Design a protein around this nucleic acid. Structure first.
Lengths: 25, 21, 828, 799
DNA sequence: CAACGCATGAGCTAGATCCG
């Protein structure tokens, strides 16, 4: 749908980042 | 702000690849 | 005499009686009432001795100190009575100091009844013969006077008398005037002083006999100092007592076409009489004031009060009942009341045209202006200041102006005004100028762009129904899932349904109240979403409370919240008509069955309550119920015969959904950081049946079926049960043949006979009657069991000699006939 | 010991378990502690991870989207207080969207000091209706526990724990399957508690090791110093983060690290008033070397340099950062969504704002009640403005009521133009006094601040109207109020009067809401007073009420209705609500009267009070009257077709009863009785219409029975005479005498005799019987029933 | 000069200081 907000945002972002890990300062 | 550049408009996969290192 | 003058209505002063200085025949009604501060010394110098014939009535209601009427109205002769007061033509109620009635000269009150009450010093009421004054005597009401207890010595003078109810009392009005009577050869024209009768046209007194020019009260019609029975052309009848020409009836129509306050009665010419209004199905032509009949819907015509009339509630709308064409402006301000469903469409559902300018100022209870259902035009001759003709402010719930598919509005001049109408959308006030045509004669109207659309939506998408399945009593409704682009915003769905007679139901109609609705609103929670094109994500709802073979209307309406830019979304499906299936019907109600012959039954029933389809036919079985065999064992000659989602709940439930959206919108914002068998009969389309070919007096049992579809392996209902009897034949109970006697020596005799070969039901008793001619009779009941055991009857206790013996057999119907007198004789 | 571990700064744990190992021996976490975003984690490896010595966490605790935590009692067994200096969207513990949490398990938690808890969105969580939150954290309404597995009562919920009675039911409160919580007697509230109920030292929370010892406590309260608890620690030491006390050497050397600003999160801690405070507050400057605070020359404000030009106040996490700053160099929005009540905490941190150099904006805020928490606003300088040239601004504030108390507040906005829209409980009077005291006087728009949509749902008027004369009757009640005139004699559509029922004096005030409802007070319109041209006239207006019930209380108030205008006057007028009671009227009929017969003298009778009493019922009134039997039952022969078998005025002023006994009257006779209810009695006795019952008592046994020898007399014509006595009193009326005679072998043959034949034969005569010795047995039957026989007496003739 | 006589009480004739 390419309008990624709501509860799908935390799931769709995981599959594109499945091994690197999330980023923080 | 992820909820203002991927909810008020469309965002590309070049943009939300920045969030993961 | 004098001149005619209209009717007075005087109260609390005496200075208003000066206007009868020259009146002679006061057409209208004179009523003198409620004068309190008047002593009897104020009524001595007051007299109207030339008032002669008043037409409507008279009324004297609580005057004080009126000593007698013989000096106020001393020359009344005729009162007519066209318009009456409680159907009474002369009302004397509750005076004091009233000694004598004293209206000594009135002769023929035409129509009504006199009502004299409760005036505690009045006698000379018993000596007034109302048999020959008013023609319809039986409705007068003379109670609670001074003369319940007879105390006052009403002696009167030399004056003639008659009889009324067996008493030969004398007749007198006062102590110095007595009731004038005329002998019965000249009934109603009235006599002169010596007893000749007057002309054949006059009422009451006449001055000179056999001259119709000079009597004082014409009975039929007055015309120019003469007296005439039917006024010929070129004259016309008016108020059925005098005759005018055409010029005397025309000018006063224009002279009070403008009202001081009311009205005038605008006069028409119609069949030789000036009447106030023509009857139904007749309308005035404005050229020569002639009255012509109708074609189609007739105008009324409804003009209005001072150019503007305001409707606050139903009681304000009652003056505009049935009004078709309105010559002025109009304004609606409705707030509330009770039972507002169909009443605003009832009072003004036949309105045709409006000609001023229309104001929907301050109206809150309405939802739509569809209750101007027959309105075609707002032409607007007079204009609202600001060059307007259509004005609307303070419409907090108005949603729909008019349906531009089933209706065609037009207008010509003026301008429009739509401000502060939030629920009224913008595309629907863009949808009216194609039909009204203000893009023609093109003008710059003033409607603000931001003042409307709030709490409203018009960019809705179209929902398509997906699958439909009907049973005999349930229908499922699943459709395609609608999501706004932010799927947290959709609170849920709203479904609407109602029965429908045809395929013509519109979408927002007939509810039009504050907290009421014609539809049946039902809710359904939204489904879940799994980012999957094929999944279990199609929403659904089950409808249960249905009826067989009905046809409904259904549609889907979303309900979403608002982002903070006044940018809403939503959807609305089409109006889809759904129809159910057929079940077997119920039983035919309350069958009845009367007979009329020896072998016929007729039936009458009702069609069933729920037919559940087009009933093609009925089906009827009849079987025999032979005889109740336990009735065989009773001696019958011993005793006889055995046989709420309120508006505050909407806001607070929508706030809590926007509170849960806000927190998990904040949580993403700080945690992510980017990188830098029996026979049958078949009766069709009827409710009766004449059965034939039956046995007499045998009870039948009848079963009824109502069967709706026949050709594809028919099905129908539980049978309704009823019982019937046939009226028995009279001849079939007589004993066939002479009754045989057998003489034994020991004075018991055998009287045997044969039973009739076709009885009606059963033969239960026998009445045998032996009697010596010249001696008394002793009855004997022969039972069925005794005849069955003995094949006759053994009659004991019989002295010798000849006897006349009568035989009969009592069956369940009645008597048959006696036989011959059975002579068994021995020679003495 | 008290705090045996090492102090330990705040941590974030993401994507693995390897970063969790640096919490090995931490005992207090200043800062916050988050556990976020762990997807590749089986439930089997959290069984061997435990943090025993974690005791108190100062800011908050956030857990969001982890996989494999069945219950928290493996990780955090011993956290007793979470304190809440820095909240997280006004919550101090937030557990949001776990997938495998079964049990809460935080079984040792005692006191949440500042904040609230929000446990949201768990598809497996049970045991949430058994916590008794109102004792743990000191507020109770600000929580939010929805959308869980405990939305239904379906998790089992077995627990083998005081079972407290805080609510109205006897429910039991437990943490997990095998741990029940501790609520001990309530003499000392939060001062700690042992197992056997003995109270601890005053300066403790949670558990205790030994009672009354400030050395071996566990979760200390005010400050901390060298293994003790001191109420105010002495000035060899200073306060720090309101939990410690620390010496001079510590609060100085943190300057030397982040005076070289490698990161702008550090703060140069400077000593002020026995505190180690980061920025010394407004009106003070730091010196060069010695690091104290000295009084300023002139004013020196702490300019509060706001990033990016805007801020959006949402909760006490964002309104925490403006604490103590005085001159905002930007603009503030206010957007508080949902909310129960936030005016208690917004005052103490952003209520010292003096000058603001942008615009305000109060949009979409629901739970605002007044704008009074801004305390020292002096001037909105307004170098910038909004889109459309505005400085102040409002939208959709559904409960705003007051801008500022204008008796003692001054506000000068230099430039810019106001804006008001959709404030359904704000009057135009409070914004027009705003218009005169502000620096702007006549800079408006047309269309200006909205004149229609403000204050629609709340009525508010200023001048009062009093009442002058009230008269009262049993159905009508009359009003008269003193007149009123605006400066325009045409600016009056009249009045409107309201009257409603109220059985008690706690009736509300007029809300002003129009929702087509029953609380619209049944409005009666009043015609306007016609233009009198006279001071004393018939324009002292009143009305008359007609449809009243007697003896009830009504609530009446009166309000005018004028045309609003462009001129800033004629707000109207409105009286205060009073109460008037009408007098009484004749009561109703007594309802459901039953008469029950039990014996030959007692008759009982009951009823109910009437449906419409119309006053306090003083007494009832019962009259009865003896009906006599039918004379047509006196002169008929009664063994033909038909036999009968039925089933001054003495009064009493019965008072405060519902049943009545009447004894001592004649037997089997019928009485007509009538009863009335009756209100006030001694002046002008006024009772209702009566109600009628027919009553019949029960029969007596030995009335119709005859004793004594019957006597037989012998005539020569074999018509034998018989004498007996009629009974002296029967049960109503003797109707037949039944004589029977008997021989040996045959049955008994009987004979009718009634009253006429008994009178005309003087006994009974027997016609034509066989000679010998016949036994005679005699009964009498009345209309009530039968009697017994007599002794069978022999009458004998010999032939 | 401060309830009642010169009515009744929401049944085409007025409307509760509505009339002294």
């Amino acid at each position: 749908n390419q309008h990624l907000c709501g509860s799908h945002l935390v799931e769709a972002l995981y599959l594109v980042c499945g091994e690197r890990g999330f980023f923080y300062t | 702000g992820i909820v203002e550049q991927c909810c008020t408009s469309i965002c590309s996969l070049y943009q939300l690849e920045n969030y993961c290192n | 005499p004098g001149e005619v003058c209209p009717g007075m209505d005087i109260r609390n002063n005496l200075t208003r009686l000066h206007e009868l200085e020259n009146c002679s025949v006061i057409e209208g009604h004179l009523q003198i009432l409620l004068m309190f501060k008047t002593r009897p010394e104020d009524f001595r110098d007051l007299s109207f001795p030339k008032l002669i014939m008043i037409t409507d009535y008279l009324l004297l209601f609580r005057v004080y100190g009126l000593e007698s009427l013989k000096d106020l109205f001393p020359n009344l002769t005729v009162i007519r009575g066209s318009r009456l007061f409680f159907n009474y033509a002369l009302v004397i109620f509750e005076m004091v100091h009233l000694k004598e009635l004293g209206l000594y000269n009135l002769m023929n009150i035409t129509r009504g009844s006199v009502r004299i009450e409760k005036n505690n010093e009045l006698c000379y009421l018993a000596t007034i013969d109302w048999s020959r004054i008013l023609d319809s005597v039986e409705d007068n009401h003379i109670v609670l006077n001074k003369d319940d207890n007879e105390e006052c010595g009403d002696i009167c003078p030399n004056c003639p008398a008659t009889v009324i109810n067996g008493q030969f009392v004398e007749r007198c009005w006062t102590h110095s005037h007595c009731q004038k009577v005329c002998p019965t050869i000249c009934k109603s024209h009235g006599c002169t002083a010596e007893g000749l009768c007057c002309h054949s046209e006059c009422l009451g007194n006449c001055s000179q006999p056999d001259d119709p020019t000079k009597c004082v009260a014409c009975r039929n019609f007055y015309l120019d100092g003469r007296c005439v029975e039917t006024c010929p052309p070129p004259y016309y009848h008016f108020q059925d007592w005098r005759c005018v020409n055409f010029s005397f009836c025309q000018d006063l129509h224009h002279k009070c076409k403008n009202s001081r306050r009311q009205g005038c009665h605008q006069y028409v010419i119609h069949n030789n009489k000036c009447i106030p209004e023509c009857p139904s199905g007749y309308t005035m032509n404005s050229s020569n004031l002639l009255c012509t009949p109708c074609l189609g819907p007739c105008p009324k015509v409804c003009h209005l009060l001072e150019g503007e009339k305001t409707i606050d509630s139903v009681t304000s709308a009652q003056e505009l009942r049935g009004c078709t064409v309105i010559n002025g402006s109009l304004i609606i301000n409705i707030r509330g009341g009770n039972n507002l469903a169909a009443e605003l469409e009832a009072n003004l559902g036949l309105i045709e045209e409006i000609s001023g300018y229309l104001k929907i100022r301050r109206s809150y209870a309405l939802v739509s202006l569809s209750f101007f259902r027959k309105l075609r035009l707002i032409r607007g001759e007079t204009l609202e200041i600001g060059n307007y003709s259509f004005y609307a402010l303070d419409n907090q719930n108005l949603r729909q102006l008019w349906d531009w598919s089933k209706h065609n509005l037009t207008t010509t001049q003026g301008k429009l005004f739509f401000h502060y109408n939030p629920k009224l959308c913008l595309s629907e006030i863009h949808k009216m100028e194609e039909v009204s045509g203000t893009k023609g004669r093109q003008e710059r109207n003033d409607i603000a762009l931001k003042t409307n659309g709030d709490k409203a939506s018009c960019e809705n998408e179209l929902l398509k129904f997906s699958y439909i399945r009907t049973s005999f009593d349930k229908i499922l409704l699943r459709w395609e899932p609608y999501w706004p682009p932010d799927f947290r915003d959709l609170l849920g769905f709203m479904l609407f349904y109602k029965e429908a007679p045809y395929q013509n139901v519109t979408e927002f109609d007939g509810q039009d109240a504050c907290g009421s609705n014609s539809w049946t609103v039902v809710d359904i929670d939204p489904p879940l979403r799994s980012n999957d094109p094929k999944s279990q994500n199609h929403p659904g709802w089950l409808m249960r409370g249905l009826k067989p073979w009905t046809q409904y209307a259904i549609f889907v309406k979303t309900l979403v919240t608002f982002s903070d830019e006044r940018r809403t979304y939503g959807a609305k499906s089409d109006i889809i008509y759904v129809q159910t299936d057929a079940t077997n019907p119920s039983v035919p109600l309350d069958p009845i069955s009367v007979s009329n012959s020896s072998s016929q039954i007729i039936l009458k029933w009702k069609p069933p309550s729920d037919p559940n389809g087009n009933i093609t036919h009925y089906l009827v079985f009849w079987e025999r119920q032979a005889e109740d065999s336990e009735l065989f064992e009773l001696d019958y000659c011993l005793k006889g015969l055995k046989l709420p989602k309120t508006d505050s709940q909407i806001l607070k439930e929508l706030e809590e959904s926007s509170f849960r959206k806000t927190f998990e919108d904040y949580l993403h914002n700080v945690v992510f950081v980017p990188r830098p068998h029996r026979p049958f009969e078949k009766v069709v389309n009827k409710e009766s049946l004449v059965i034939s070919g039956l046995r007499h007096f045998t009870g039948y049992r009848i079963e009824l079926q109502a069967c709706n579809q026949d050709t594809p392996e028919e099905r129908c209902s539980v049978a309704a049960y009823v019982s019937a009897r046939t009226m028995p034949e009279a001849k079939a109970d007589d004993i066939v043949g002479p009754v045989t006697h057998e003489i034994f020596e020991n004075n018991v005799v055998h009287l045997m006979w044969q039973e009739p070969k076709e009885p009606n039901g059963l033969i239960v008793l026998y009445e045998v009657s032996y009697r010596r001619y010249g001696d008394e009779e002793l009855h004997l009941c022969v039972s069925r069991k005794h005849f069955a055991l003995e094949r006759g009857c053994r009659l004991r206790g019989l002295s010798p000699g000849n006897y006349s013996v009568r035989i009969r057999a009592t069956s369940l119907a009645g008597n048959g006939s006696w036989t011959e007198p059975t002579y068994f004789y021995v020679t003495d």
